[PDB]
Protein backbone atom coordinates (compact mmCIF):
# COMPACT_ATOMS: atom_id res chain seq x y z
CA UNK A 1 0.00 0.00 0.00
CA UNK A 2 3.26 2.00 0.02
CA UNK A 3 2.91 4.15 3.16
CA UNK A 4 6.24 2.68 4.29
CA UNK A 5 8.10 4.57 1.56
CA UNK A 6 8.08 7.83 3.43
CA UNK A 7 8.35 6.49 6.98
CA UNK A 8 11.71 4.89 6.14
CA UNK A 9 14.47 6.48 8.23
CA UNK A 10 17.06 8.28 6.18
CA UNK A 11 20.76 7.45 6.33
CA UNK A 12 23.29 9.94 7.74
CA UNK A 13 24.02 12.94 5.51
CA UNK A 14 27.38 14.67 5.90
CA UNK A 15 28.16 18.19 4.67
CA UNK A 16 31.88 18.77 5.19
CA UNK A 17 33.50 22.07 4.44
CA UNK A 18 36.39 22.15 1.99
CA UNK A 19 38.96 21.96 4.79
CA UNK A 20 37.23 18.93 6.32
CA UNK A 21 36.84 17.25 2.90
CA UNK A 22 40.38 15.87 2.82
CA UNK A 23 40.46 12.53 1.01
CA UNK A 24 37.47 10.14 1.20
CA UNK A 25 39.30 7.42 3.14
CA UNK A 26 40.54 9.72 5.90
CA UNK A 27 37.09 11.32 6.04
CA UNK A 28 35.36 7.95 6.21
CA UNK A 29 37.67 7.00 9.04
CA UNK A 30 36.59 10.09 10.98
CA UNK A 31 32.86 9.40 10.49
CA UNK A 32 33.02 5.56 10.63
CA UNK A 33 31.86 5.04 14.27
CA UNK A 34 28.53 6.63 13.37
CA UNK A 35 28.09 5.90 9.65
CA UNK A 36 29.10 2.22 9.83
CA UNK A 37 26.10 1.58 12.09
CA UNK A 38 23.86 2.41 9.11
CA UNK A 39 25.62 0.54 6.28
CA UNK A 40 25.16 3.51 3.94
CA UNK A 41 25.76 7.25 4.13
CA UNK A 42 25.73 10.33 1.93
CA UNK A 43 28.35 13.08 1.62
CA UNK A 44 27.56 16.41 -0.05
CA UNK A 45 30.62 17.53 -1.99
CA UNK A 46 31.84 21.01 -0.97
CA UNK A 47 33.72 21.11 -4.29
CA UNK A 48 32.05 21.87 -7.61
CA UNK A 49 33.43 20.82 -10.97
CA UNK A 50 34.48 23.47 -13.47
CA UNK A 51 33.83 21.24 -16.50
CA UNK A 52 30.53 19.34 -16.04
CA UNK A 53 30.18 15.67 -16.86
CA UNK A 54 28.70 16.08 -20.33
CA UNK A 55 31.48 18.44 -21.35
CA UNK A 56 34.10 16.01 -20.04
CA UNK A 57 32.53 13.14 -21.98
CA UNK A 58 32.22 15.17 -25.19
CA UNK A 59 35.34 17.41 -25.09
CA UNK A 60 37.97 15.51 -23.07
CA UNK A 61 37.24 12.18 -24.80
CA UNK A 62 37.08 11.20 -28.47
CA UNK A 63 33.73 9.97 -29.84
CA UNK A 64 32.53 8.64 -26.50
CA UNK A 65 29.85 5.98 -27.03
CA UNK A 66 28.49 3.13 -24.91
CA UNK A 67 26.29 0.07 -25.24
CA UNK A 68 23.36 -0.59 -22.95
CA UNK A 69 22.11 -3.73 -21.29
CA UNK A 70 18.40 -4.53 -21.19
CA UNK A 71 17.20 -5.07 -17.63
CA UNK A 72 13.86 -6.79 -16.97
CA UNK A 73 11.72 -5.05 -14.38
CA UNK A 74 10.47 -8.31 -12.81
CA UNK A 75 13.50 -10.60 -12.74
CA UNK A 76 11.59 -13.64 -11.45
CA UNK A 77 9.28 -13.68 -14.49
CA UNK A 78 12.09 -14.85 -16.82
CA UNK A 79 14.05 -18.07 -17.30
CA UNK A 80 17.84 -18.23 -17.60
CA UNK A 81 17.95 -18.04 -21.43
CA UNK A 82 15.91 -14.84 -21.59
CA UNK A 83 18.34 -13.16 -19.17
CA UNK A 84 21.28 -13.95 -21.48
CA UNK A 85 19.37 -12.53 -24.44
CA UNK A 86 18.44 -9.45 -22.40
CA UNK A 87 22.08 -8.64 -21.58
CA UNK A 88 23.06 -8.57 -25.28
CA UNK A 89 19.83 -6.92 -26.55
CA UNK A 90 21.20 -3.46 -25.82
CA UNK A 91 21.95 -0.62 -28.20
CA UNK A 92 24.87 1.74 -28.77
CA UNK A 93 24.23 5.40 -27.88
CA UNK A 94 25.86 8.76 -27.49
CA UNK A 95 25.44 10.48 -24.14
CA UNK A 96 23.14 13.03 -25.78
CA UNK A 97 20.93 10.57 -27.68
CA UNK A 98 20.58 8.30 -24.66
CA UNK A 99 19.52 11.38 -22.69
CA UNK A 100 16.94 12.27 -25.32
CA UNK A 101 15.60 8.71 -25.55
CA UNK A 102 15.18 8.61 -21.77
CA UNK A 103 13.42 11.97 -21.76
CA UNK A 104 11.00 10.99 -24.54
CA UNK A 105 10.19 7.73 -22.74
CA UNK A 106 9.62 9.68 -19.51
CA UNK A 107 7.42 12.21 -21.30
CA UNK A 108 5.38 9.43 -22.87
CA UNK A 109 4.71 8.04 -19.41
CA UNK A 110 3.98 11.37 -17.66
CA UNK A 111 3.01 13.80 -20.49
CA UNK A 112 6.08 15.91 -19.61
CA UNK A 113 9.74 15.15 -19.17
CA UNK A 114 10.21 17.45 -16.19
CA UNK A 115 11.62 15.77 -13.08
CA UNK A 116 8.86 14.77 -10.68
CA UNK A 117 8.89 14.79 -6.85
CA UNK A 118 10.99 12.09 -5.22
CA UNK A 119 8.10 10.54 -3.25
CA UNK A 120 5.96 10.35 -6.38
CA UNK A 121 8.56 8.48 -8.42
CA UNK A 122 9.50 6.17 -5.53
CA UNK A 123 5.87 5.06 -5.21
CA UNK A 124 5.66 4.86 -9.01
CA UNK A 125 8.66 2.53 -9.17
CA UNK A 126 7.34 0.12 -6.55
CA UNK A 127 3.82 0.07 -7.99
CA UNK A 128 5.34 -0.57 -11.43
CA UNK A 129 7.35 -3.50 -10.03
CA UNK A 130 4.24 -4.93 -8.36
CA UNK A 131 1.70 -4.61 -11.18
CA UNK A 132 3.10 -2.59 -14.11
CA UNK A 133 3.18 -3.55 -17.77
CA UNK A 134 6.61 -2.17 -18.71
CA UNK A 135 8.79 -5.20 -19.31
CA UNK A 136 12.31 -3.77 -19.50
CA UNK A 137 14.52 -0.74 -19.05
CA UNK A 138 17.79 0.17 -20.76
CA UNK A 139 20.88 1.14 -18.81
CA UNK A 140 24.64 1.31 -19.18
CA UNK A 141 26.38 -0.30 -16.24
CA UNK A 142 30.06 -1.08 -15.96
CA UNK A 143 31.08 1.34 -18.72
CA UNK A 144 34.77 2.25 -18.61
CA UNK A 145 35.58 5.91 -18.91
CA UNK A 146 35.26 8.76 -16.44
CA UNK A 147 33.36 12.04 -16.19
CA UNK A 148 35.78 13.67 -13.76
CA UNK A 149 37.66 16.43 -15.51
CA UNK A 150 41.36 15.99 -16.14
CA UNK A 151 41.72 19.76 -16.48
CA UNK A 152 44.13 21.14 -13.85
CA UNK A 153 41.91 23.93 -12.54
CA UNK A 154 38.95 21.66 -11.76
CA UNK A 155 38.44 21.69 -7.97
CA UNK A 156 36.63 18.35 -8.03
CA UNK A 157 38.69 16.64 -10.73
CA UNK A 158 41.96 17.65 -9.08
CA UNK A 159 40.82 16.62 -5.59
CA UNK A 160 41.39 13.27 -3.92
CA UNK A 161 37.63 12.67 -4.22
CA UNK A 162 38.12 12.21 -7.96
CA UNK A 163 37.32 8.50 -7.93
CA UNK A 164 40.19 7.68 -10.32
CA UNK A 165 42.56 8.54 -7.45
CA UNK A 166 40.83 6.56 -4.70
CA UNK A 167 42.39 3.11 -5.07
CA UNK A 168 45.95 4.52 -4.88
CA UNK A 169 45.29 6.62 -1.75
CA UNK A 170 47.65 5.91 1.18
CA UNK A 171 44.84 4.32 3.23
CA UNK A 172 43.55 2.28 0.28
CA UNK A 173 44.31 -1.37 1.02
CA UNK A 174 44.11 -2.19 -2.69
CA UNK A 175 46.86 0.29 -3.54
CA UNK A 176 49.06 -2.80 -3.04
CA UNK A 177 47.55 -4.77 -5.93
CA UNK A 178 49.79 -5.03 -8.98
CA UNK A 179 46.96 -6.21 -11.25
CA UNK A 180 44.04 -4.17 -12.55
CA UNK A 181 40.45 -5.02 -11.64
CA UNK A 182 37.56 -3.10 -13.26
CA UNK A 183 35.38 -1.41 -10.67
CA UNK A 184 38.02 -2.08 -8.00
CA UNK A 185 41.31 -0.49 -9.06
CA UNK A 186 39.44 1.77 -11.53
CA UNK A 187 36.00 3.40 -11.37
CA UNK A 188 33.20 2.63 -13.78
CA UNK A 189 30.56 4.85 -15.35
CA UNK A 190 26.84 4.21 -14.88
CA UNK A 191 24.16 5.76 -17.06
CA UNK A 192 20.53 5.21 -16.16
CA UNK A 193 16.99 6.20 -17.02
CA UNK A 194 13.64 6.14 -15.24
CA UNK A 195 13.28 2.93 -13.17
CA UNK A 196 16.64 1.41 -14.13
CA UNK A 197 17.71 -0.29 -10.95
CA UNK A 198 20.34 -2.17 -8.97
CA UNK A 199 18.86 -5.16 -7.15
CA UNK A 200 19.61 -6.19 -3.64
CA UNK A 201 23.13 -7.19 -3.18
CA UNK A 202 26.67 -6.82 -1.39
CA UNK A 203 29.84 -5.97 -3.14
CA UNK A 204 32.38 -8.82 -4.11
CA UNK A 205 34.77 -9.53 -1.26
CA UNK A 206 32.57 -7.37 0.99
CA UNK A 207 34.38 -4.26 -0.22
CA UNK A 208 33.25 -0.69 0.34
CA UNK A 209 31.71 1.15 -2.57
CA UNK A 210 31.73 4.89 -3.22
CA UNK A 211 29.46 6.41 -5.87
CA UNK A 212 29.36 9.99 -7.17
CA UNK A 213 26.42 11.38 -9.17
CA UNK A 214 27.53 13.71 -11.90
CA UNK A 215 24.22 14.88 -13.37
CA UNK A 216 20.59 14.04 -13.90
CA UNK A 217 17.65 12.78 -11.92
CA UNK A 218 17.55 11.52 -8.34
CA UNK A 219 18.77 8.05 -7.40
CA UNK A 220 17.14 6.27 -4.46
CA UNK A 221 19.17 3.82 -2.35
CA UNK A 222 18.13 1.44 0.40
CA UNK A 223 20.94 0.21 2.63
CA UNK A 224 21.35 -2.41 5.33
CA UNK A 225 23.93 -2.14 8.14
CA UNK A 226 26.71 -4.68 7.83
CA UNK A 227 25.73 -5.98 11.27
CA UNK A 228 22.33 -7.05 9.90
CA UNK A 229 23.69 -8.99 6.91
CA UNK A 230 22.96 -12.46 8.29
CA UNK A 231 19.50 -11.38 9.42
CA UNK A 232 18.88 -9.99 5.92
CA UNK A 233 19.78 -13.31 4.33
CA UNK A 234 17.76 -15.28 6.89
CA UNK A 235 14.68 -13.15 6.27
CA UNK A 236 15.09 -13.29 2.50
CA UNK A 237 15.42 -17.08 2.57
CA UNK A 238 12.21 -17.35 4.55
CA UNK A 239 10.30 -14.89 2.38
CA UNK A 240 11.37 -16.49 -0.90
CA UNK A 241 10.24 -19.82 0.56
CA UNK A 242 6.86 -18.54 1.78
CA UNK A 243 6.63 -16.79 -1.62
CA UNK A 244 6.56 -13.45 0.16
CA UNK A 245 9.36 -12.73 -2.35
CA UNK A 246 8.61 -13.74 -5.94
CA UNK A 247 11.25 -15.97 -7.56
CA UNK A 248 11.68 -19.47 -8.94
CA UNK A 249 12.08 -22.16 -6.30
CA UNK A 250 15.62 -22.07 -4.98
CA UNK A 251 16.56 -25.73 -5.29
CA UNK A 252 19.24 -24.98 -2.69
CA UNK A 253 22.22 -23.25 -4.27
CA UNK A 254 23.78 -20.11 -2.81
CA UNK A 255 22.27 -16.96 -1.56
CA UNK A 256 24.30 -15.03 -4.10
CA UNK A 257 22.46 -16.94 -6.86
CA UNK A 258 19.03 -17.03 -5.31
CA UNK A 259 19.11 -13.26 -5.04
CA UNK A 260 19.77 -13.14 -8.78
CA UNK A 261 16.49 -14.99 -9.33
CA UNK A 262 14.16 -12.74 -7.32
CA UNK A 263 12.14 -9.81 -8.54
CA UNK A 264 13.49 -6.86 -6.59
CA UNK A 265 11.51 -6.75 -3.37
CA UNK A 266 10.52 -3.66 -1.38
CA UNK A 267 12.07 -2.73 1.97
CA UNK A 268 8.70 -3.23 3.72
CA UNK A 269 9.19 -7.00 3.55
CA UNK A 270 12.40 -6.51 5.52
CA UNK A 271 10.88 -3.97 7.92
CA UNK A 272 8.09 -6.46 8.71
CA UNK A 273 10.84 -8.75 9.95
CA UNK A 274 12.80 -6.22 11.89
CA UNK A 275 15.92 -5.76 9.78
CA UNK A 276 16.91 -2.07 9.61
CA UNK A 277 16.77 -0.28 6.25
CA UNK A 278 17.91 3.28 5.62
CA UNK A 279 17.16 5.45 2.61
CA UNK A 280 19.45 7.79 0.70
CA UNK A 281 18.14 9.97 -2.12
CA UNK A 282 21.21 11.06 -4.06
CA UNK A 283 21.38 14.08 -6.40
CA UNK A 284 24.22 15.38 -8.60
CA UNK A 285 27.11 16.56 -6.46
CA UNK A 286 26.68 13.91 -3.76
CA UNK A 287 28.67 10.81 -2.87
CA UNK A 288 27.05 7.69 -1.45
CA UNK A 289 29.22 5.25 0.50
CA UNK A 290 28.25 1.68 1.31
CA UNK A 291 30.17 -0.15 4.04
CA UNK A 292 31.59 -3.70 4.07
CA UNK A 293 28.87 -6.37 3.89
CA UNK A 294 26.12 -3.71 3.71
CA UNK A 295 23.33 -4.94 1.46
CA UNK A 296 21.94 -2.26 -0.84
CA UNK A 297 19.40 -1.75 -3.63
CA UNK A 298 18.01 1.20 -5.54
CA UNK A 299 16.67 2.78 -8.68
CA UNK A 300 16.95 5.85 -10.89
CA UNK A 301 14.30 8.58 -11.15
CA UNK A 302 15.19 9.46 -14.75
CA UNK A 303 18.23 10.05 -16.91
CA UNK A 304 21.35 10.14 -14.75
CA UNK A 305 25.10 9.59 -14.90
CA UNK A 306 27.19 8.41 -11.97
CA UNK A 307 30.60 6.91 -11.30
CA UNK A 308 31.56 4.27 -8.75
CA UNK A 309 34.56 2.38 -7.42
CA UNK A 310 35.04 -0.19 -4.68
CA UNK A 311 37.78 -0.08 -2.08
CA UNK A 312 39.10 -1.34 1.24
CA UNK A 313 40.85 0.05 4.32
CA UNK A 314 42.28 -1.62 7.43
CA UNK A 315 38.88 -1.97 9.12
CA UNK A 316 37.71 -4.08 6.15
CA UNK A 317 40.07 -6.97 6.89
CA UNK A 318 37.71 -8.89 9.26
CA UNK A 319 35.03 -8.67 6.58
CA UNK A 320 37.34 -9.81 3.78
CA UNK A 321 38.19 -12.86 5.90
CA UNK A 322 34.52 -13.81 6.17
CA UNK A 323 34.13 -13.35 2.42
CA UNK A 324 37.17 -15.52 1.77
CA UNK A 325 35.54 -18.26 3.84
CA UNK A 326 32.35 -18.03 1.82
CA UNK A 327 34.40 -18.05 -1.40
CA UNK A 328 36.10 -21.23 -0.21
CA UNK A 329 32.83 -22.78 0.94
CA UNK A 330 31.21 -22.14 -2.45
CA UNK A 331 34.32 -23.39 -4.31
CA UNK A 332 34.75 -20.07 -6.13
CA UNK A 333 37.89 -18.13 -6.99
CA UNK A 334 38.10 -15.08 -4.70
CA UNK A 335 38.29 -11.64 -6.22
CA UNK A 336 41.23 -10.38 -4.17
CA UNK A 337 44.55 -11.86 -2.94
CA UNK A 338 43.51 -11.74 0.70
CA UNK A 339 46.60 -13.40 2.19
CA UNK A 340 48.92 -11.17 0.17
CA UNK A 341 47.15 -7.99 1.30
CA UNK A 342 47.30 -9.13 4.94
CA UNK A 343 51.02 -9.86 4.69
CA UNK A 344 51.97 -6.69 2.82
CA UNK A 345 50.06 -4.36 5.15
CA UNK A 346 51.39 -6.22 8.20
CA UNK A 347 55.03 -6.00 7.11
CA UNK A 348 54.54 -2.31 6.34
CA UNK A 349 53.30 -1.80 9.91
CA UNK A 350 56.16 -3.90 11.33
CA UNK A 351 58.60 -1.76 9.36
CA UNK A 352 57.57 1.53 10.94
CA UNK A 353 56.83 2.23 14.57
CA UNK A 354 56.74 6.01 14.96
CA UNK A 355 54.48 7.29 12.18
CA UNK A 356 51.67 5.12 13.57
CA UNK A 357 52.06 5.37 17.34
CA UNK A 358 51.94 9.20 17.63
CA UNK A 359 48.87 10.52 15.71
CA UNK A 360 46.40 7.66 15.00
CA UNK A 361 42.56 7.94 14.83
CA UNK A 362 40.37 5.31 16.52
CA UNK A 363 39.10 3.63 13.35
CA UNK A 364 42.60 3.68 11.83
CA UNK A 365 44.05 2.12 14.98
CA UNK A 366 41.32 -0.53 14.97
CA UNK A 367 42.14 -1.30 11.34
CA UNK A 368 45.82 -1.65 12.23
CA UNK A 369 44.86 -4.06 15.01
CA UNK A 370 42.67 -6.03 12.57
CA UNK A 371 45.59 -6.32 10.14
CA UNK A 372 48.00 -7.39 12.89
CA UNK A 373 45.49 -9.94 14.20
CA UNK A 374 44.82 -11.45 10.78
CA UNK A 375 48.58 -11.62 10.18
CA UNK A 376 49.31 -13.30 13.52
CA UNK A 377 46.60 -15.91 12.92
CA UNK A 378 47.83 -16.57 9.37
CA UNK A 379 51.46 -17.02 10.45
CA UNK A 380 50.36 -19.32 13.29
CA UNK A 381 48.32 -21.61 11.13
CA UNK A 382 51.03 -21.74 8.55
CA UNK A 383 53.64 -22.58 11.17
CA UNK A 384 51.56 -25.45 12.55
CA UNK A 385 50.69 -26.74 9.08
CA UNK A 386 54.36 -26.63 8.05
CA UNK A 387 55.40 -28.46 11.20
CA UNK A 388 52.89 -31.23 10.51
CA UNK A 389 53.95 -31.32 6.85
CA UNK A 390 57.59 -31.75 7.85
CA UNK A 391 56.82 -34.47 10.39
CA UNK A 392 54.77 -36.45 7.87
CA UNK A 393 57.69 -36.79 5.46
CA UNK A 394 55.26 -36.72 2.51
CA UNK A 395 56.50 -33.36 1.14
CA UNK A 396 60.17 -33.91 0.41
CA UNK A 397 60.70 -30.92 -1.86
CA UNK A 398 61.23 -27.34 -0.73
CA UNK A 399 61.49 -24.31 -3.02
CA UNK A 400 61.78 -20.60 -2.30
CA UNK A 401 58.46 -19.17 -3.52
CA UNK A 402 58.86 -15.97 -5.55
CA UNK A 403 55.48 -16.09 -7.30
CA UNK A 404 52.56 -13.80 -6.75
CA UNK A 405 49.37 -15.22 -5.34
CA UNK A 406 48.38 -18.60 -6.80
CA UNK A 407 44.98 -20.29 -6.66
CA UNK A 408 44.50 -23.64 -4.94
CA UNK A 409 43.36 -26.34 -7.36
CA UNK A 410 40.95 -27.92 -4.83
CA UNK A 411 39.36 -25.17 -2.74
CA UNK A 412 40.43 -22.16 -4.90
CA UNK A 413 41.71 -20.19 -1.90
CA UNK A 414 44.49 -17.72 -2.63
CA UNK A 415 48.00 -18.84 -1.62
CA UNK A 416 50.63 -16.18 -0.98
CA UNK A 417 52.87 -17.57 1.78
CA UNK A 418 52.95 -21.25 0.84
CA UNK A 419 51.50 -23.84 -1.48
CA UNK A 420 52.15 -27.52 -2.17
CA UNK A 421 53.08 -28.02 -5.83
CA UNK A 422 52.70 -31.25 -7.81
CA UNK A 423 54.96 -32.97 -10.32
CA UNK A 424 53.32 -31.36 -13.37
CA UNK A 425 52.54 -27.80 -12.03
CA UNK A 426 48.78 -27.99 -12.74
CA UNK A 427 47.59 -29.34 -9.38
CA UNK A 428 48.97 -26.99 -6.68
CA UNK A 429 47.09 -26.96 -3.38
CA UNK A 430 46.97 -24.71 -0.33
CA UNK A 431 48.23 -26.04 2.99
CA UNK A 432 44.75 -26.95 4.30
CA UNK A 433 44.61 -30.33 2.55
CA UNK A 434 45.85 -33.69 3.80
CA UNK A 435 48.77 -34.52 1.52
CA UNK A 436 48.42 -38.26 2.14
CA UNK A 437 44.91 -38.10 0.63
CA UNK A 438 45.85 -36.23 -2.56
CA UNK A 439 45.57 -38.60 -5.51
CA UNK A 440 47.21 -36.67 -8.23
CA UNK A 441 47.62 -38.06 -11.75
CA UNK A 442 51.09 -36.54 -12.07
CA UNK A 443 52.66 -38.57 -9.23
CA UNK A 444 53.23 -38.44 -5.50
CA UNK A 445 56.27 -36.17 -5.15
CA UNK A 446 55.21 -32.93 -3.46
CA UNK A 447 57.19 -29.69 -3.27
CA UNK A 448 56.48 -26.99 -0.69
CA UNK A 449 56.78 -23.49 -2.16
CA UNK A 450 57.47 -21.21 0.81
CA UNK A 451 57.89 -17.44 0.62
CA UNK A 452 61.53 -16.46 0.98
CA UNK A 453 61.18 -14.07 3.95
CA UNK A 454 59.01 -16.34 6.13
CA UNK A 455 61.32 -15.93 9.14
CA UNK A 456 61.16 -12.12 9.06
CA UNK A 457 57.37 -12.42 9.00
CA UNK A 458 57.35 -14.88 11.90
CA UNK A 459 59.39 -12.35 13.88
CA UNK A 460 56.95 -9.57 12.99
CA UNK A 461 54.11 -11.85 14.11
CA UNK A 462 55.76 -12.70 17.43
CA UNK A 463 56.20 -9.00 18.12
CA UNK A 464 52.58 -8.14 17.20
CA UNK A 465 51.48 -11.05 19.46
CA UNK A 466 52.62 -9.14 22.54
CA UNK A 467 51.08 -5.77 21.68
CA UNK A 468 47.98 -4.59 23.52
CA UNK A 469 44.79 -4.83 21.50
CA UNK A 470 46.21 -7.69 19.42
CA UNK A 471 44.15 -10.33 21.26
CA UNK A 472 43.65 -13.69 19.63
O1 LIG B 1 25.56 2.85 -9.68
C1 LIG B 1 24.80 1.88 -9.46
O2 LIG B 1 23.64 1.81 -9.91
C2 LIG B 1 25.31 0.75 -8.60
C3 LIG B 1 25.73 1.29 -7.24
C4 LIG B 1 26.32 0.17 -6.41
O3 LIG B 1 25.79 -0.93 -6.40
C5 LIG B 1 27.53 0.42 -5.63
O4 LIG B 1 28.21 1.44 -5.86
O5 LIG B 1 27.87 -0.41 -4.76
NI1 LIG C 1 26.71 -2.13 -5.00
ZN1 LIG D 1 42.85 -25.39 -0.78
ZN1 LIG E 1 50.15 -32.32 -11.42
Author numbering: 93 to 564
Give the text the authors published on this PDB structure:
Here we investigate the role of histone demethylases in plant flowering through the analysis of Arabidopsis JMJ13, which we show possesses H3K27me3 site-specific demethylase activity in vitro and in vivo. The recombinant expressed JMJ13 catalytic domain (JMJ13CD, residues 90–578) displayed unambiguous demethylation activity against H3K27me3 peptides, but not H3K4me3, H3K9me3, or H3K36me3 peptides, confirming that JMJ13 is an H3K27me3 site-specific histone demethylase. JMJ13 has a central catalytic domain flanked by flexible regions on both N- and C-termini. Our genetic studies suggest that JMJ13 acts as a flowering repressor, which modulates flowering time in a temperature- and photoperiod-dependent manner.
The crystal structure of the JMJ13 catalytic domain (JMJ13CD), including the predicted jumonji, helical, and zinc finger domains, in complex with the co-factor α-ketoglutarate (α-KG), was determined to 2.4 Å resolution. Despite being in different subfamilies, the overall structure of JMJ13CD resembles the previously reported structures of human KDM5A/B/C and Arabidopsis JMJ14, which are composed of two parts: the jumonji domain and the helical plus zinc finger domains. The jumonji domain adopts a typical α-KG-dependent oxygenase fold with a double-stranded β-helix in the center surrounded by several α-helices. A Ni2+ ion, which replaced the endogenous Fe2+ ion during nickel column purification, and the co-factor α-KG are located in the active center of the jumonji domain. The helical domain consists of four long α-helices forming a helical bundle. However, our structural analysis showed that the predicted C5HC2 zinc finger of JMJ13 in fact adopts a C4HCHC arrangement, which is composed of a CCCH-type zinc finger (Cys500, Cys503, Cys522, and His525) and a CCHC-type zinc finger (Cys514, Cys516, His519, and Cys534). Rather than the predicted Cys507, the His525 contributes to zinc coordination in the C4HCHC-type zinc finger domain in JMJ13. Although the C4HCHC zinc finger domain is embedded in the primary sequence of the helical domain, structurally it forms an independent domain that interacts with the helical domain in a similar manner to the helical and C5HC2 domains of JMJ1424.
